[PDB]
Amino acid sequence: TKPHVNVGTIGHVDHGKTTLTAAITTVLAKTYG
Amino acid sequence: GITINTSHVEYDTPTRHYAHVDCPGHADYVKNMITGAAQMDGAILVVAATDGPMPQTREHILLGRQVGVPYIIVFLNKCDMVDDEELLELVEMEVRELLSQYDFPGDDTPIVRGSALKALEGDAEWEAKILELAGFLDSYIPEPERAIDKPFLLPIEDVFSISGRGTVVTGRVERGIIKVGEEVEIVGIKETQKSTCTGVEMFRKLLDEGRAGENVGVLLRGIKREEIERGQVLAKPGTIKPHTKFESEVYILSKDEGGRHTPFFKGYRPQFYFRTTDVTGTIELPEGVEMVMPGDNIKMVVTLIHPIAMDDGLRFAIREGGRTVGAGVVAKVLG
Ligand SMILES: CN(C)[C@@H]1C(O)=C(C(N)=O)C(=O)[C@@]2(O)C(O)=C3C(=O)c4c(O)cccc4[C@@](C)(O)[C@H]3C[C@@H]12
Ligand SMILES: Nc1nc2c(ncn2[C@@H]2O[C@H](COP(=O)(O)OP(=O)(O)O)[C@@H](O)[C@H]2O)c(=O)[nH]1
Numbered sequence: 001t002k003p004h005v006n007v008g009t010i011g012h013v014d015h016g017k018t019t020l021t022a023a024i025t026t027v028l029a030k031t032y033g
Numbered sequence: 034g035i036t037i038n039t040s041h042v043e044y045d046t047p048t049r050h051y052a053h054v055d056c057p058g059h060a061d062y063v064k065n066m067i068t069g070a071a072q073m074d075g076a077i078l079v080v081a082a083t084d085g086p087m088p089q090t091r092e093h094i095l096l097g098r099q100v101g102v103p104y105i106i107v108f109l110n111k112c113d114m115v116d117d118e119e120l121l122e123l124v125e126m127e128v129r130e131l132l133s134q135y136d137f138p139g140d141d142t143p144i145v146r147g148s149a150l151k152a153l154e155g156d157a158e159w160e161a162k163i164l165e166l167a168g169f170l171d172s173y174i175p176e177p178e179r180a181i182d183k184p185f186l187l188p189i190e191d192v193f194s195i196s197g198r199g200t201v202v203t204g205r206v207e208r209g210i211i212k213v214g215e216e217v218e219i220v221g222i223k224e225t226q227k228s229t230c231t232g233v234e235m236f237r238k239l240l241d242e243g244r245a246g247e248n249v250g251v252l253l254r255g256i257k258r259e260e261i262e263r264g265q266v267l268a269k270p271g272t273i274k275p276h277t278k279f280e281s282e283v284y285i286l287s288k289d290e291g292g293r294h295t296p297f298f299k300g301y302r303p304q305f306y307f308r309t310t311d312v313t314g315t316i317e318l319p320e321g322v323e324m325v326m327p328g329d330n331i332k333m334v335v336t337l338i339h340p341i342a343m344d345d346g347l348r349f350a351i352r353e354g355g356r357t358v359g360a361g362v363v364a365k366v367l368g
């Protein structure tokens with residue numbers, strides 16, 4: 001079973017934290033599953 | 034209670050599984066980081082290349098240092114807007130400096146230049162950068178240490194004396210493992226006492242060992258049920274020491290969250306809830322501040338009336354007669 005790591009996006013408002021979060025999720029599934 | 038706005042998403046890379054938080058506003062980040070609601074083994078600092086660092090950028094990094102986030106990876110976003118190799122290099126230098134300012138290795142810190150927007154739209158030249166970031170999540174953040182691998186720590190929730198067998202302390206093992214026969218220390222409040230685990234029971238079923246996460250009862254060799262004071266903890270000898278003075282970051286609930294209506298000033302002596310009890314303490318605010326408003330977060334040096342077993346990162350509540358008025362994390366112990 002895979003190691004589990006907790007991360008998160010911090011930074012100033014409107015700099016892209018949430019959009020990047022969506023991107024990570026998308027690109028990763030698309031590429032590895 | 035504390036109002037908290039968060040997003041929790043999970044995803045995978047070929048070798049690891051990730052749990053990722055994202056909060057809408059600055060206040061959320063503050064509340065989350067301090068209350069430990071959202072704990073992080075590593076953080077992704079997002080900085081729009083168009084605006085460069087900003088106040089919250091700085092504040093988040095500082096908060097990170099304070100609450101104990103060990104690593105930070107940077108993602109220069111909105112690069113699909115800039116096109117001056119010169120400009121970007123500028124922003125980077127700014128950021129690395131900024132990280133170094135707060136003791137993060139600004140030089141060795143990975144910085145990916147990308148575009149969250151384009152990547153999301155499907156443009157593969159940009160999706161590439163997302164994969165690069167993921168690579169750093171995998172390589173840069175070391176695999177975190179599991180609860181069971183840490184030294185034994187058990188916050189005592191109650192005490193009992195079972196006839197002819199001895200004194201039984203109960204509680205949930207916070208971390209590590211305790212095996213019958215092992216020697217343990219009782220630390221906090223009074224002077225550290227030593228003893229031997231002569232047994233581990235759980236609803237009469239006799240056990241071998243008590244493991245992190247389990248609600249067990251630990252049997253102690255010759256130590257009266259009255260020598261145990263509320264607030265003390267059971268721990269692997271020499272792994273945790275009692276302290277009274279520490280520096281910390283705190284969030285003071287707003288009126289709406291059910292906190293104070295009025296600000297407090299120097300000389301405020303509230304009670305600090307550590308695991309199981311309140312412990313009164315004095316407050317040293319930073320220079321220049323003479324009053325703290327409800328809803329503010331502030332650096333604060335605290336001095337406890339009795340010593341409590343603690344290490345960097347321990348969370349606590351500030352209470353005014355049972356009522357919770359604030360929450361904090363121990364940024365660094367002093368004595
Ligand atoms: C266009 N976009 C997708 C959304 C939006 O309309 C936003 C806005 N400012 O108008 C966001 O900020 C929006 O992009 C955004 O940042 C949102 C959030 O960050 C979160 C987080 O982190 C946690 C819980 C809920 C939200 C959220 C529902 O407010 C998110 C809404 C996002
Ligand atoms: N051009 C461009 N716009 C972006 C990029 N990432 C995010 N945005 C936009 O910037 C806005 C703020 O992004 P958001 O993720 O909501 O920022 P947050 O407040 O940090 O969550 C959103 O409307 C996006 O459309 C990017 O890489 N390029």
Ligand SMILES: [Mg+2]
Nearest residue numbers: 017018056057
């Ligand atoms: Mg957001």
